[PDB]
Design a protein around this ligand. Sequence first.
Ligand code: AGS
Ligand code: AGS
Ligand code: MG
Ligand code: MG
Lengths: 183, 81, 198, 377
Amino acid sequence: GKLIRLELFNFKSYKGHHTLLFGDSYFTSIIGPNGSGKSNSMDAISFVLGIKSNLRDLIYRGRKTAWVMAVYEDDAGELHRWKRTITANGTSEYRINDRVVNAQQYNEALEKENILIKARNFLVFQGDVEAIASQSPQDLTRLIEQISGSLEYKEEYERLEEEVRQATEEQAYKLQRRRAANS
Amino acid sequence: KAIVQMAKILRKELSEEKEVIFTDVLKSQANTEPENITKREASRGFFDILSLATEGCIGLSQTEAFGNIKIDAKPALFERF
Amino acid sequence: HVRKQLEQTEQEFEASKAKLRQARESFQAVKQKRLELFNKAFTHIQEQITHVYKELTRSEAYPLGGQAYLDIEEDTDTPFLSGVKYHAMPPCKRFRDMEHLSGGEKTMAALALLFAIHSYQPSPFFVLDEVDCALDNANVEKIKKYIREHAGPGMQFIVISLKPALFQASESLIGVYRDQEANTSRTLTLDLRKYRHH
Amino acid sequence: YIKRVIIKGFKTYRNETIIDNFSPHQNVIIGSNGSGKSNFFAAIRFVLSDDYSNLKREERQGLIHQGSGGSVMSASVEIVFHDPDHSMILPSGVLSRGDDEVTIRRTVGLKKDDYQLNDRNVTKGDIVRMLETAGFSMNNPYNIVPQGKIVALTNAKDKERLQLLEDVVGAKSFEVKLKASLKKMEETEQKKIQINKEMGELNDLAERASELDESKDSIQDLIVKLKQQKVNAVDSTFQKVSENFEAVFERLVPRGTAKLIIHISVSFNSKQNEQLHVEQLSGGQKTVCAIALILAIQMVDPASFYLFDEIDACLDKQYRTAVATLLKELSKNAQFICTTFRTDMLQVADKFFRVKYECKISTVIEVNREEAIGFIR
Ligand SMILES: Nc1ncnc2c1ncn2[C@@H]1O[C@H](COP(=O)(O)OP(=O)(O)OP(O)(O)=S)[C@@H](O)[C@H]1O
Ligand SMILES: Nc1ncnc2c1ncn2[C@@H]1O[C@H](COP(=O)(O)OP(=O)(O)OP(O)(O)=S)[C@@H](O)[C@H]1O
Ligand SMILES: [Mg+2]
Ligand SMILES: [Mg+2]
């Protein structure tokens, strides 16, 4: 499908209700001078889909609450309103189609339409090209381990590495003190 | 260079009228009918008015999705470009 | 007295060996799962990185473009534990060390790597920051010719850009200006299908 | 100040490449991505500064031209100055303002080839000795702005900026000398504690124990007094930096205030607003504050030639206009070699060089008014 629009309310620079309309356009560029909030709109895109990577810092400062809603239409034609809200105490409420949803079902509804935040395939941050141009081969292995979906089963891999290593080492010294008991 | 030209067209359109439509300034600058205006000119003028607006010299109003842009004058427009 | 001690130590040793086999075959199972899930993504990006770099480095003066490939240092049993080296060779250029490349050539290789990583699990949209602002006009025009040829149904492009050679060819503009007397950001939008080319 | 550069056999250059006739005011080198306009700066750094100090075979092969199997022998860069009075080591046939025999060709080979001093092979020490008395320094953080430094000073946190300020002061002559006395402290402690306890076993050795106790008192005296010297230098340099930064930022941005608060964080804004450090900033004003800090670092010790590889990355019309006007005002005292892609430092500069790209070799030409033609095509 495609993103129809974002609706922002008291997100970083945007005092009150603002609307970022994409419409029928499959190539829409965000322009403006420095300090204007283009990267704030990209951070609204990044935040409305569930990136945590200071959650009170996103509310607007003049000198209460904040929310951002992504409207997305799939291949059938139905809208999927995804609203994230920063409430008064620093907790984030998730809503799909005006219905309150927890974290895992929200990310499951995103992964249903091939939006994988856990892979982060589709966001290029300011300076990420210079970072990946200055990356190490281990950093690039980490990135392909990220996007492959195989960054999961990592802690299970290392845990069971320790399990089989303790098991074979205890087996070997079991053999040695067993022949010592036979001695 | 560019913003001075845009500033002159805005001082001219906003000297007589209280509000002016962006597409009228674009037709005035291109010196042709709107069907012949090109993407490079429209984008250049659009970015120029965003820059002029960010400095606090002009006002911008748009009330419909992909609708007309209404431009109004501020006092600071006639002393800083 | 020692014989039943011997058999009990032997059999709990055998039970430890049996749970060793349990954890070991479970380790080989999760290792094979991790290996296949890494290997299919590796094969996909290795086959697409060449085509995206040929699309990013060809022009009128050189129609075939450069060539790029990423590969395992030490392919023995676990490619996911070894490093991947990314070789990116522009037109008429060849090195032994990759960091001798330019700013624009590094930005081109980085953008080719990001576009080849992205089309493994293709998201319905793709958002780009100001990656164009370390580039000359020819590389910005090649970025525009790549994006205009790929933006469509199933792959939407939203770029944050300051270079007019890039955002002059978008399908619509979202112009964000900071209203300073109210201390807010504001948006305007413009349809670039109303205007002609050239 | 600097007069003409002669580059032969370097990384993307021909059999000999002469760039000449640039006035001591601001001069701009342009090209395209892959031309070598950042490799000319790596030809300048190869002689004057100390980036390429002592190199093994891979770094030498990175320097030497791999040009289609030809001229892989050597690389050489000569830089000619002009001065009414300039420092020197030995007279060596003093040319009339042609002091190039002192900044010698810097010949490197596949093996360790040692360069000369007008037909006499002479160590690097005499070169850095004459550049000592020429008002320069071979490890300054301002005379080299390479590709990726201003983006590094926009992602450096507060302690790394304080360490770069500490190397701007050069106050590790009060710190690593204090680290040598720290070596003295650890060895003296775990030696002479055992020495005085075995002397107290025997106890005229209590005299030796007493003056080693007063030697540890002397260690205390020197460490607290050199910490006093370190803070005495650092806060004076910071009192210079903070106000230079205030003046530079109020000249760049004519609508805001900018200080430094030492704990480094930079409390600034763009109008009558609050404080925001480098976590909560747009990339535009982040690179504005980074180049304002570096234009403050120049003002603690000004030199005669500077190198600006894309000092205005991707800012704005107003920010490039302000940086170009401030650099034109600053070019009344020193050379300002720069690199641009945008014409805001082309309408105000004086000399314009173009690096003509081919795909293995490159050469530099000089016309002045075809450059804005080359960028506003
Ligand atoms: N929570 C907040 N409340 C109010 N203002 C904020 C907040 N967070 C950030 N800002 C301001 O918004 C600015 C960021 O504006 P952006 O529009 O993101 O910059 P940008 O212009 O899009 O990126 P550049 O400059 O073009 S690379 C910061 O520099 C702050 O001045
Ligand atoms: N030993 C070498 N033999 C041949 N070519 C080399 C050698 N070392 C470097 N080069 C080339 O020299 C060039 C160095 O890049 P530069 O053009 O200096 O960067 P730049 O393009 O000037 O700066 P940008 O555009 O802002 S990234 C590249 O084209 C390298 O391939
Ligand atoms: Mg930004
Ligand atoms: Mg460069």
